[PDB]
Ligand binder design. Structure first.
Ligand code: UDP
Ligand code: UDP
Lengths: 457, 439
């Protein structure tokens, strides 16, 4: 018996992405088995595994780790730190019954690389952001450790950073804003240090999207300067409630609209809009003239790092008469069925926060994106997709890291997105490349095979 | 761009197969390009005919060296894939600093056997010829059963031919890897034997990457073949015995009359590929008989007119894949063996030339998948197989209402399908080869 142990990152999004690649690995090598270790959050996994076939399910096991006690920005980090001993024991126990081919860790979970080192087991990272961001975050840690450049000092409008694999200088203004906090800067640098200790890094991208970055990693690996990096994506989650029923209503409305005529606006799992920003969007949407599906959520009260909620009364928040005047032009919704909308033939553009899964989803369906970065590494993602790759346009977002984007600037971005024609052509060609990369013979298909072959040595 | 250069061997069973694995490799990794160098006889795949000048191959060494050097100009020469008969080019690859590989189109068991014969004749001075006796048994790595000296290929009787074959086996050991047209579940003990030997740094890596099969303009043999398939469409499932003897097999009149007696007495439905040896030496294609009604027993074609069909060259894979076909009297060439297994058609063995006597031994005695017809050796010329022995072989093939060998063949057939699909043994073995090539 030969086992890979997965420790997914927090959230059903990260669980789902991890289980998609777990299924892929099991289908690509019948000798492989997988055990998934899930970590409880003190506030079901088998459901998200796409297989329905006993040739595959007989080879995967799911274990929930024993819940643990302990007394913020480091909340999830602390829970995973309390679970290291449980992971170590679970992994040690499994290795009594199997050849332990490796511990596969979500990039958030790389504190567990220590556990693999202590047991003498190979470690691998499942890196769920872009290859370019892997290069950027590693280079920031390297500058800080080897050249004494503390990251806070680079976070300036007059600073440019030479990132391996990038033609364009990377502005210090797109360093993720959380690096200004010294505790969090050190945590992220330490993640990057741990990446370098592993036996290989799976990245959710395809090499034709990020070819110069992937070449830079290939060179570094050949010089023993970095682990092997495997571009194996796009790994996407493409397959009762009333939020699911409002989703069918939107799709039904989308069915009656003309092809590529609807602008979709959606801002990820933690994004939200304050009332004044929402009113500026509304004004811009009404003035733009294009059909729209607008996912609109309010920030959680008493908790900026809580999950966003829906607006109780959108009629009191939005401009007077907006919903009446736009009743046949567009729809406003809460949580959205995003992939169904992006894959719908009526959808013509995507105003996106540029989270990496939203970026890959829009690329997969060939929908051009107008960028509106908000948190995490979204500002860098918008720079890579816009300035470096030329696949996206910006939504007049000069502010990069409490400044509102005016209706004039939003309408200017929608005009570029929908009125340009050259970018849409580049997005369609890249979309075709994304579909072929994961098919037989494609770059991500063969890179996944190469990873499996390394693992099975 | 990364190039693999193939030098295939002669004959349908060697050349068609090399083109199939070249096509498979090109489909399986788009980073790959393939050039095929064709040795004459007396979007990403390229064919080169080498200029015309057994020892055919050695006169071509310099043309091969030069074509390979010229390709190495606009591409990364990942390696040279050679047929088992072309491995004199291992020197060319060595001289040019390029990895060499063998694409071995016979069984892994035969790879072990021919390598062991070379090992015995290299240490001990005794020639292989002195083992080709009825009271000789050979311990071949990977075989539970001792291998009779009777099934050493007959060509080993010639001192010069045996030495050249030993030279081939010696050169296999010098390559970077041997790809074999088999799947590990078919020959698992042999493949374990190679894995042990490679791990002890005693043999190149051996990749079981098959079955590699040729399943695929208007012609007259195309037309007769189409007639056969239409006739098969009208027969009950597993009701027809197919008889076919490879690209060089043929039947003399007395042997053909014994087959005709057996078929008429057995009462089974049949498709019988009947060809006579070319008067122009066995180094040319067999041909149909003229006026077959004057060759076969009197009235045979009249009495069997609704029971079966006699043809020349046959659409073999189409017949083996047809649901009416229930059994295959076969010369046990390795491609025929793989094709019949793929379609789950049990074989009754009638070895004739090359390594077929060994293949029949491996499939029958060692693996239990085939049934034997008679007991002739690799060096017995002209011994007629009686109608009675043929009848008994066909009874075992078609009977049981019994069906125990058919059950093993069906289960082995399913294993052959799975081995080359996503995740199977041969799928991942080919990936390991592709990885080595791309490294
Ligand atoms: O209303 C929404 C918002 C987001 N998503 C999905 O949630 C994920 C968002 O991930 P991304 O990496 O883009 O951003 P994050 O949530 O990590 O900031 C994607 O799969 C979206 O399709 C969704 O289905 N509905
Ligand atoms: O009448 C015939 C005889 C042979 N074959 C094909 O020729 C090949 C024979 O290869 P094998 O290795 O069995 O024997 P060989 O020709 O090398 O003796 C196989 O692909 C058969 O399907 C065919 O199509 N029709």
């Amino acid at each position: 018996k030969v086992e890979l142990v997965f420790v997914p990152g927090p959230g059903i999004g990260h669980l789902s992405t991890a289980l998609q690649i777990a299924d892929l690995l099991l289908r690509r090598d019948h000798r492989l088995s997988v055990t998934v270790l899930s970590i409880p959050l003190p506030w079901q996994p088998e459901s998200l595994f796409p297989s329905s076939t006993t040739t595959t399910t007989s080879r995967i096991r799911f274990i929930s780790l024993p819940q643990r006690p302990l007394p913020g920005p480091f909340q999830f980090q602390a829970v995973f730190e309390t679970q290291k001993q449980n992971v170590k024991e679970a992994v040690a126990k499994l290795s009594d019954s199997s050849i332990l081919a490796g511990l596969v860790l979500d990039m958030f979970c790389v504190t567990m690389v220590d556990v693999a080192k202590q047991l003498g087991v190979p470690s691998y990272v499942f890196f769920t952001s872009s290859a370019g961001y892997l290069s950027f975050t590693s280079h920031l840690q390297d500058l800080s450790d080897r050249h004494g450049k503390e990251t806070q000092q680079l976070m300036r409008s007059d600073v440019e950073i030479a990132v391996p694999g990038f033609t364009n200088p990377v502005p210090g203004k797109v360093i993720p804003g959380v690096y200004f906090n010294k505790n969090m800067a050190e945590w992220l640098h330490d993640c990057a240090r741990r990446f370098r200790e592993t036996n290989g890094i799976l990245v959710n991208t395809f090499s034709e999207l990020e070819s110069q970055v992937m070449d830079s990693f290939s060179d570094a690996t050949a010089a023993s300067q970095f682990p092997a990096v495997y571009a194996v994506g796009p790994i996407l989650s493409l397959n009762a409630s009333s939020e699911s029923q409002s989703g069918d209503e939107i799709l039904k409305w989308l069915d009656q609209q003309p092809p590529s005529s609807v602008v979709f606006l959606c801002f990820g799992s933690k994004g939200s809009l304050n009332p004044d920003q929402a009113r500026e969007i509304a004004h811009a949407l009404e003035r733009s003239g294009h059909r729209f599906v607008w996912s609109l959520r309010q920030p959680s009260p008493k908790g900026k790092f809580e999950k966003p909620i829906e607006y109780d009364n959108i009629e009191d928040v939005l401009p007077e008469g907006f919903l009446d005047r736009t009743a046949e032009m567009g729809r406003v919704i809460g949580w959205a069925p995003q992939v169904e909308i992006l894959g719908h033939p009526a959808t013509g553009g995507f105003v996106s926060h540029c989270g990496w899964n939203s970026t890959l989803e829009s690329l997969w369906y060939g929908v051009p994106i107008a960028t509106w970065p908000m948190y995490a590494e979204q500002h860098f993602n918008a720079f890579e997709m816009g300035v470096e790759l030329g696949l996206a346009v910006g939504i007049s977002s000069e502010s990069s890291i409490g400044v509102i984007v005016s209706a004039e600037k939003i309408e200017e971005g929608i005009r570029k997105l929908m009125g340009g024609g050259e970018v849409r052509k580049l997005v369609k060609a890249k979309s075709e490349e994304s579909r072929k990369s994961v098919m037989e013979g494609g770059s991500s298909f063969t890179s996944l095979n190469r990873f499996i072959d390394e693992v099975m040595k």
